[PDB]
Amino acid sequence: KLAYEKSIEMAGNYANQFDAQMEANQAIARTLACTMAEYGSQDREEAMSIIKRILNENPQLIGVYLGYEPDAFDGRDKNYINAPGHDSTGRFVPYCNKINGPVIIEPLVHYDSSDYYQLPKTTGKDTLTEPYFYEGIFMVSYDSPIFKNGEFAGIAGVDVPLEYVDDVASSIRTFDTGYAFMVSNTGIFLSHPTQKNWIGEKSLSDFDVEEIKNAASDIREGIGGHVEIKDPITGKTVIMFYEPVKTGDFSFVLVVPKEEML
């Protein structure tokens, strides 16, 4: 019992450790959205300088961006058609990033259809995408709507690489062979100490094991809990303790061999 309780508190502790930097990254995008909502200077080069500075001052980010509805930044999309950092619409959609190494600004793509833009637009709320790969890099995006005159004008966002999650979670050891990993809200692995091919590829909901499917349903709802799983080949029971990460309802999971715990 004291054994279970210590493990529940450990899982909650690490879930909140991971949550702290996520709350900071969410606040960066949100604070940029507040600022842009009041930005009547309407100076595209200055706004590009601002997102470049925020990227440079935050090494945990790989991209910082703004994406606006037609004519919503400055009423002058026609004057920026195919300008540097722009596409053939002239919409202000600068994506300042270091994905390919050096810092560049290019237009966002898929803003008319992808969730990073469409979810804030339709919900009016700050959003966090499911983790994904983009040009070889595992990341998540945080996006906040920009409301001007009470109306949706666009989004401000940041891209956050998640390699650090694997670096940190895959070194956690508990008891003799206990270990830990993180998953997204839909149960996709963000880390695993041995199965690197599972990262961003497999979900808990993919396991043909009733208890792991039950955990994954709880994680999807942001609920903490634990399941006990008996391996019918070895006869051993492992307990998976999962505790929600408040930002996004991701989950931190500790996997502990029951016989070691007791």
From TrEMBL:
<protein>
    <recommendedName>
        <fullName>histidine kinase</fullName>
    </recommendedName>
</protein>
